[PDB]
Design a protein around this ligand. Structure first.
Ligand SMILES: O=CN(O)CCOc1cccc(C(=O)c2ccccc2)c1
Ligand code: NI
Length: 192
């Protein structure tokens, strides 16, 4: 069991735990977690966040051969559960382990990072503007089953949507304009 070996106290998540394109799991819709959470589900969220911090540490990332990341979703670890971790640097602009996250409202205005996007499960560069909602209101539960409702914009908004896409089986390039990858449509805000 992926969640079983990953949640072992001694286990450190690394690139070898992250599945890549082709693996059906990344295109499957993740199952919601029930409350109360099991100890493994709590530990998993903590392991995921630990990985993000390790991936953002020069020495640590080097040692473990880690790709820098600002977010991670359980499906990427071959665990089909609606659990995601986000860690956006400013200490941190956003630090959160989210259970059953859901977008409950979104702006009509769209947004896209001017540099495009990349994915830990994608070993290649896919240029283009990843079209997302500029702003989103997200509901999620923390490890204690406490509900949170937050509003995100700018970079944080993009990052959370990218991870939520993973628990719904969507990849970043699925939102890039096939015709013109760098086309600027009315209402699209380019971030940079
Ligand atoms: O699912 C998780 N991953 O694949 C890890 C990466 O997650 C994310 C989430 C949102 C954006 C990106 C980027 O590619 C990026 C673009 C410009 C500036 C900074 C970041 C990566
Ligand atoms: Ni990704």
């Amino acid at each position: 069991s992926a969640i079983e070996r990953i949640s072992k106290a001694a286990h450190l998540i690394d690139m070898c735990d992250i599945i890549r394109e082709g693996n059906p799991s990344l295109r499957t819709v993740a199952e919601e977690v029930t409350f109360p959470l099991s100890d493994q589900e709590i530990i998993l969220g903590e392991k995921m966040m630990q990985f993000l911090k390790h991936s953002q540490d020069p020495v640590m990332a080097e040692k473990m051969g880690l790709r820098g990341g600002v977010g991670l979703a359980a499906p990427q670890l071959d665990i089909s559960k609606r659990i995601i971790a986000v860690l956006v640097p400013n200490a941190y602009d956003l630090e959160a382990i989210m259970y059953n996250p859901k977008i409950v409202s979104h702006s009509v205005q769209d947004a896209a990072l001017g540099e495009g996007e990349g994915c830990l499960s994608v070993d290649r560069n896919v240029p283009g503007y990843v079209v997302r909602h500029a702003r989103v209101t997200v509901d999620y539960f923390d490890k204690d089953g406490e509900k949170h409702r937050i509003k995100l914009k700018g970079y944080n908004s993009i990052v959370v949507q990218h991870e939520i896409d993973h628990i719904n089986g969507i990849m970043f390039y699925d939102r890039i304009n096939e015709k013109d990858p760098f086309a600027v449509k009315d209402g699209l805000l380019i971030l940079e």
